[PDB]
Design an enzyme around this catalytic site. Structure first.
Site, PDB file in Angstrom:
ATOM      1  N   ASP A 145       0.809  -1.048   0.021  1.00 60.59           N
ATOM      2  CA  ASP A 145      -0.134  -0.049  -0.094  1.00 60.59           C
ATOM      3  C   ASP A 145       0.996   1.299   0.002  1.00 60.59           C
ATOM      4  O   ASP A 145       1.888   1.080   0.325  1.00 60.59           O
ATOM      5  CB  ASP A 145      -0.716   0.317   1.336  1.00 60.59           C
ATOM      6  CG  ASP A 145      -1.973  -0.897   1.215  1.00 60.59           C
ATOM      7  OD1 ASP A 145      -3.076  -0.646   0.290  1.00 60.59           O
ATOM      8  OD2 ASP A 145      -1.926  -1.954   1.722  1.00 60.59           O
ATOM      9  N   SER A 218     -13.988  -8.962   2.385  1.00 61.44           N
ATOM     10  CA  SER A 218     -14.782  -7.965   3.099  1.00 61.44           C
ATOM     11  C   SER A 218     -14.214  -6.745   2.896  1.00 61.44           C
ATOM     12  O   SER A 218     -14.894  -5.648   3.592  1.00 61.44           O
ATOM     13  CB  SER A 218     -14.581  -8.650   4.597  1.00 61.44           C
ATOM     14  OG  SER A 218     -13.355  -8.469   5.049  1.00 61.44           O
ATOM     15  N   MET A 219     -13.525  -6.378   2.127  1.00 59.10           N
ATOM     16  CA  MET A 219     -12.825  -5.089   2.073  1.00 59.10           C
ATOM     17  C   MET A 219     -13.845  -3.956   1.667  1.00 59.10           C
ATOM     18  O   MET A 219     -14.613  -4.374   0.382  1.00 59.10           O
ATOM     19  CB  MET A 219     -11.654  -4.895   1.093  1.00 59.10           C
ATOM     20  CG  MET A 219     -11.439  -3.487   0.650  1.00 59.10           C
ATOM     21  SD  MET A 219      -9.664  -3.192  -0.009  1.00 59.10           S
ATOM     22  CE  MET A 219      -9.823  -4.539  -1.355  1.00 59.10           C
ATOM     23  N   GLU A 260     -16.708 -17.099   5.807  1.00 56.41           N
ATOM     24  CA  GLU A 260     -15.194 -17.172   5.304  1.00 56.41           C
ATOM     25  C   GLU A 260     -14.823 -18.485   4.615  1.00 56.41           C
ATOM     26  O   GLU A 260     -15.310 -19.578   5.265  1.00 56.41           O
ATOM     27  CB  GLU A 260     -14.468 -16.952   6.297  1.00 56.41           C
ATOM     28  CG  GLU A 260     -13.930 -15.299   6.619  1.00 56.41           C
ATOM     29  CD  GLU A 260     -13.026 -14.850   7.667  1.00 56.41           C
ATOM     30  OE1 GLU A 260     -12.155 -15.572   7.873  1.00 56.41           O
ATOM     31  OE2 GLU A 260     -13.455 -13.879   8.207  1.00 56.41           O
ATOM     32  N   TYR A 280     -17.052  -2.455  -3.322  1.00 60.43           N
ATOM     33  CA  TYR A 280     -16.589  -1.541  -2.389  1.00 60.43           C
ATOM     34  C   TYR A 280     -17.466  -0.307  -1.968  1.00 60.43           C
ATOM     35  O   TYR A 280     -17.881   0.361  -3.006  1.00 60.43           O
ATOM     36  CB  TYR A 280     -15.206  -0.922  -3.019  1.00 60.43           C
ATOM     37  CG  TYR A 280     -14.041  -2.076  -3.326  1.00 60.43           C
ATOM     38  CD1 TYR A 280     -13.870  -3.184  -2.336  1.00 60.43           C
ATOM     39  CD2 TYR A 280     -13.274  -1.937  -4.665  1.00 60.43           C
ATOM     40  CE1 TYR A 280     -12.804  -4.040  -2.407  1.00 60.43           C
ATOM     41  CE2 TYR A 280     -12.112  -2.809  -4.750  1.00 60.43           C
ATOM     42  CZ  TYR A 280     -12.170  -3.941  -3.775  1.00 60.43           C
ATOM     43  OH  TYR A 280     -11.095  -4.950  -3.769  1.00 60.43           O
ATOM     44  N   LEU A 296     -10.037  -8.648  -7.722  1.00 63.99           N
ATOM     45  CA  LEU A 296      -9.922  -8.309  -9.043  1.00 63.99           C
ATOM     46  C   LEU A 296      -9.037  -8.960  -9.807  1.00 63.99           C
ATOM     47  O   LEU A 296      -9.285  -9.495 -10.817  1.00 63.99           O
ATOM     48  CB  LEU A 296      -9.988  -6.676  -9.184  1.00 63.99           C
ATOM     49  CG  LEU A 296     -11.271  -5.975  -8.933  1.00 63.99           C
ATOM     50  CD1 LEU A 296     -10.889  -4.416  -8.628  1.00 63.99           C
ATOM     51  CD2 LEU A 296     -12.566  -6.315  -9.911  1.00 63.99           C
ATOM     52  N   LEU A 297      -7.809  -9.206  -9.223  1.00 63.29           N
ATOM     53  CA  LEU A 297      -6.721  -9.943  -9.842  1.00 63.29           C
ATOM     54  C   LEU A 297      -7.281 -11.474 -10.050  1.00 63.29           C
ATOM     55  O   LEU A 297      -7.007 -11.924 -11.057  1.00 63.29           O
ATOM     56  CB  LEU A 297      -5.514 -10.047  -9.015  1.00 63.29           C
ATOM     57  CG  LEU A 297      -4.271 -10.912  -9.809  1.00 63.29           C
ATOM     58  CD1 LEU A 297      -3.993 -10.570 -11.009  1.00 63.29           C
ATOM     59  CD2 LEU A 297      -3.140 -10.608  -8.497  1.00 63.29           C
ATOM     60  N   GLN A 298      -7.905 -12.005  -9.119  1.00 67.33           N
ATOM     61  CA  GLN A 298      -8.401 -13.326  -9.308  1.00 67.33           C
ATOM     62  C   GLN A 298      -9.413 -13.513 -10.332  1.00 67.33           C
ATOM     63  O   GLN A 298      -9.300 -14.315 -11.297  1.00 67.33           O
ATOM     64  CB  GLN A 298      -9.029 -13.678  -7.856  1.00 67.33           C
ATOM     65  CG  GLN A 298      -8.233 -13.788  -6.765  1.00 67.33           C
ATOM     66  CD  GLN A 298      -7.329 -15.227  -6.267  1.00 67.33           C
ATOM     67  OE1 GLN A 298      -6.293 -15.471  -7.260  1.00 67.33           O
ATOM     68  NE2 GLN A 298      -7.382 -15.901  -5.361  1.00 67.33           N
TER      69      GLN A 298
END
Length: 373
Positions: A145, A218-219, A260, A280, A296-298
């Site tokens: 980050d 969960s982000m 989860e 989001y 999003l990468l997955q």
């Protein structure tokens, strides 16, 4: 012992549901003795609700987990951003004190290491120490980050600016992070990796007949997205996995809410979906999140069309933007995603190849963000 690695992070390696730093650490553990030293944990963490609280009875001792030596350092208090400008001299004093009192175990591990990896955040405060303890060690900063996004205290921003040129490697998840990094010659782009066996994990399909959409994670999770989406698309089943909450009373019956799931179990729900969703709740996110979003990468690995806020569409095809809280935009984006073809547009290196580049980016000159030597 092959190369010996030390990772410094505010994560602990034992916390369930791995973040990027865990996946890198798994690769390190395959290469040599690997230590993971967990920071920013204190008795004060109890009042704040730290995810590492289940590990409290192991604090200040070494625990072996999945081939990695783990240490959760617990102090009485830890330094943090008070977000009050008048409290800055107090903050600075607290950070200096923290950095000035490392435990013996940290010093020993620093000395023993060939490579020390500092994750973006509190680990910045220990870069100078590492140089003093072991000037031979390769110092690698993994920018998961940007410092301003995680809103670190002023002390941390200033210390990072001060030490950044001294690092062997600054490995940015996104080139969009480079604008706030006060260094050039040691700054490289190495994005997140993926599991080398993602395609083997996807089969078999967890779904029966019909149209299935998936959200994982969960982000900034936004239930309002699904309240709207489920009503507007009664023919679509929405599979909401690991959202961090339960069945919002506004969800239509076409929403299935799961607890989860371990990474490997999620893959079938992703690969076999019609489209994916990154719900989001806010667009107050950095420009780099389009690149750094693990979910999003997955989706992108499989070429799964994605619905996500406009702010995270970024430089990507097959992502359909909406404005959180705006029902019409949600509906319009889903409409587009339903008709989007599945194409593997994004190149996704596996975790081993990714780790190779994090550790030795100069061997892969395409990672350079500034003119090659």
């Amino acid at each position: 012992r092959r190369p010996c690695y030390l990772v410094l992070s505010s994560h602990d390696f034992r916390t369930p549901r791995r973040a990027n730093i865990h996946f890198i650490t798994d690769q390190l553990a395959l290469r040599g003795t690997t230590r993971f030293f967990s920071l920013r944990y204190s008795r004060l963490s109890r009042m704040k609700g730290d995810m590492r609280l289940p590990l409290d009875d192991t604090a200040n001792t070494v625990v072996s987990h999945n081939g990695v030596d783990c240490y959760l350092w617990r102090t009485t208090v830890h330094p943090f951003n008070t977000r009050r400008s008048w409290l800055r001299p107090v903050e600075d004093a607290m950070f200096r004190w923290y950095a000035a009192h490392p435990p013996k175990q940290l010093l020993d591990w620093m000395r023993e290491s060939d490579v020390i990896v500092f994750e973006s955040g509190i680990a910045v405060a220990f870069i100078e120490l590492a140089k003093r303890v072991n000037p031979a060690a390769k110092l690698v900063y993994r920018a998961s980050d940007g410092l301003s996004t995680i809103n670190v205290a002023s002390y941390i921003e200033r210390e990072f600016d001060r030490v950044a040129p001294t690092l062997d490697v600054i490995a940015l998840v996104s080139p969009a992070m480079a604008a706030e990094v006060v260094s050039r010659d040691n700054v490289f782009h190495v994005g997140h990796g993926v599991d080398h066996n993602l395609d083997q994990l996807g089969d078999p399909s967890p779904y029966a007949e019909g149209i299935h959409a998936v959200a994982v994670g969960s982000m900034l999770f936004d239930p309002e997205f699904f309240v709207v989406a489920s009503k507007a698309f009664p023919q679509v089943t929405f599979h909401v996995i690991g959202s961090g909450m339960g069945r919002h009373p506004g969800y239509g019956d076409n929403v299935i809410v799961y607890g989860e799931m371990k990474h490997a179990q999620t893959i079938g729900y992703i690969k076999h979906a019609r489209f994916g969703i990154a719900p989001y709740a806010s667009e107050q996110v950095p420009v780099y999140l389009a690149d750094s979003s693990m979910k999003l990468l997955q989706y992108d690995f499989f070429g799964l069309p994605a619905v996500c806020p406009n702010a995270v569409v970024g430089p990507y095809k097959s992502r359909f933007g909406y404005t959180p809280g705006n029902a019409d935009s949600v509906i319009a984006a889903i409409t587009q995603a339903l008709e989007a073809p599945r194409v593997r547009y994004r190149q996704c290196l596996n975790w081993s190849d990714t780790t190779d580049r994090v550790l030795d980016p100069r061997a892969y000159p395409e990672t350079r963000l500034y003119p090659h030597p």
